[PDB]
Ligand SMILES: O=C(O)c1ccccc1S
């Protein structure tokens with residue numbers, strides 16, 4: 144009776160094993176666009192993915208992670224609200240059973256079909272396991288997905304999902320360029336928060352891009368064919384792997400843009 148996204152083990156249950164679920168800086172949150180303040184002092188955001196080295200794709204039983212070589216400064220996030228250098232370790236998505244839900248963050252209560260999380264760790268802490276124990280350990284770039292035109296740069300991801308249908312399956316996934324998942328504009332909102340999955344650690348500087356990317360209905364349908372279960376277990380479609388918005392408490396959301 145491990146955590147998940149079902150009636151008996153979903154987000155409303157997580158606080159029993161993970162009391163930080165009711166903490167002071169939980170994610171996601173609703174972004175109230177009229178309350179977010181422009182912060183002219185945010186430095187420009189720097190997303191440097193030219194030398195990124197993807198390795199593998201893994202179905203971990205709650206999402207799929209595209210993993211990178213993070214043993215050198217190859218793919219880094221800098222600038223914006225951040226002090227120092229954050230290294231890309233993985234990306235994953237959260238998505239819905241239907242196009243009208245799936246994102247974790249909301250914008251004026253609007254839900255997107257899905258949300259991409261590009262996860263980076265602060266190099267001053269040496270490794271990801273140490274970084275998640277620090278209040279400035281991670282920087283996550285959050286990107287909304289809406290259903291419309293296909294995203295060409297997503298198709299290589301979509302096409303390998305049949306090979307990692309069930310929990311614990313992985314596949315080689317080299318030479319994937321995450322620049323093909325970014326929208327035109329880097330305008331963003333930022334606030335201090337948490338992992339959206341257990342263990343819900345309060346270690347994340349969230350950087351949520353305002354401009355969504357468009358994916359096709361056929362692309363997100365292939366996400367929804369994944370399974371939460373292992374091979375030879377009863378089939379449970381991997382859908383609605385999102386946590387709903389949490390109380391903002393004593394936080395301010397800052398905007399990079401007027
Ligand atoms: O899903 C996770 O475990 C996660 C991990 C790192 C950063 C963000 C998230 S939401």
Ligand SMILES: [Zn+2]
Nearest residue numbers: 235237260339
């Ligand atoms: Zn996530």
